[PDB]
Amino acid sequence: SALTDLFPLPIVQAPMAGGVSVPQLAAAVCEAGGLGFLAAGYKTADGMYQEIKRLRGLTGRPFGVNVFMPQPELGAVEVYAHQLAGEAAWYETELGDPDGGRDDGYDAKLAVLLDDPVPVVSFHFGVPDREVIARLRRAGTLTLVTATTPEEARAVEAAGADAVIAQGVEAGGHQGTHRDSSEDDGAGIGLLSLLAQVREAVDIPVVAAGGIMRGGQIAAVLAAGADAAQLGTAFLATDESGAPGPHKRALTDPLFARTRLTRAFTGRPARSLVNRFLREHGPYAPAAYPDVHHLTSPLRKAAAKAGDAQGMALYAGQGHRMARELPAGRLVEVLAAELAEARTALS
């Protein structure tokens, strides 16, 4: 409730890196009664700060900022790089440096978030030290962390976080596993099942994420114990979304009818529409994040520049085909109406 008391509708716009969730998206969601989110992933502490300032100028409503947890360091990357030689030659460029930073400006970003507190902060790819959570709490910032299993959820709670984001296997983008291993492959838990398990494993509020595209699904997760629903793909296709045109188009394109979890683009499991890049490199992508992400960055930028969807990281949840293209503000009101209608029906 401490979370749901911040905004009127149980709808959260998921932070989406790669220039997807720009300030204008968050603002439209915020102004419509939902919780807009900025994505600090892959940006510099300064870049993130500029968006925060920008957004404050667009809305006075509560919003969130998401940060990536630093990843532990460490021949597999060399082999994969070799297999990408053809991609480099084709897009006429060179692979990025796989040994770049792995902290993603964590320290600097926390410094910014503590020096000028924002309403909400979420973390992905792990759990912050409980000291980070305590300091943010004292600053008046609510904290959220993603969990993909009841065990990870317990870790989130034990750290003192205000709420846990239960991200099911249907979710688009990166799976928020706290540690990536070949064992996670084929072990993903369906949201409806994960939510029930998490709801019984912890006592803190739960935000449900994964495949939510309609108001009735929001009603569904609330009925199963969630305090709110977090939607990424549904907002990815809205007008304020900064996602590339080829990306927004792929979502409802019959030729991109299926999605699959893959490490091809970044070295960590992420759900993307199946395309050429995924089919050819998916089976061989090693578990090396963010090493692989650095490596393929030039390839993806080149592909995007050319408008070639077959070479881009088309992150999307299993509900992508139900995506709707319209202002984010209108999407929220539509979702709200569907929610109301579903509530009424269930009574």
Comparing CB distances to a second copy, the nearer of 56 and 260 is: 260
Contacts of 344 (CB under 8 A, 6+ apart): none
Query: Is 230 annotated as belonging to a binding site?
Result: yes
Site map (CB under 6 A) of ligand FMN, residues 154-183, x = contact = -------------x--xxxxx---------
Residue 21, CA distances (Å) to 29, 66, 133, 190, 319 in order = 11, 11, 24, 25, 19
Contacts of 183 (CB under 8 A, 6+ apart): none
Interface of this chain with a second copy, residues 148 to 187, rule: CB under 8 A: 168-170, 186-187
Query: Is 319 annotated as belonging to a binding site?
Result: no
Query: Is 233 annotated as belonging to a binding site?
Result: yes
Comparing CB distances to a second copy, the nearer of 134 and 274 is: 274
If one asks whether residue 250 binds ligand FMN (CB under 6 A), the answer comes out as no
Residue 195 tokens, joined: 């939510």
Query: Is 172 annotated as belonging to a binding site?
Result: yes
Residue 181, CA distances (Å) to 9, 47, 81, 288, 295 in order = 36, 31, 20, 10, 20
Interface of this chain with a second copy, residues 212 to 251, rule: CB under 8 A: 212-214, 216-217, 219-225
d(CA 18, CA 40): 9
Element at 325 (helix H, strand E): none
**Cβ pair 194, 168 in contact under 8 A:** yes
Site map (CB under 6 A) of ligand FMN, residues 205-234, x = contact = ----xxxx-----------------xxxx-
Query: Is 85 annotated as belonging to a binding site?
Result: no
If one asks whether residue 340 binds a second copy (CB under 8 A), the answer comes out as no
Site map (CB under 6 A) of ligand FMN, residues 102-141, x = contact = ----------------------x-----------------
DSSP state of 63: E
Binding positions for FMN are: 17, 66, 167, 172, 211, 230, 232-233
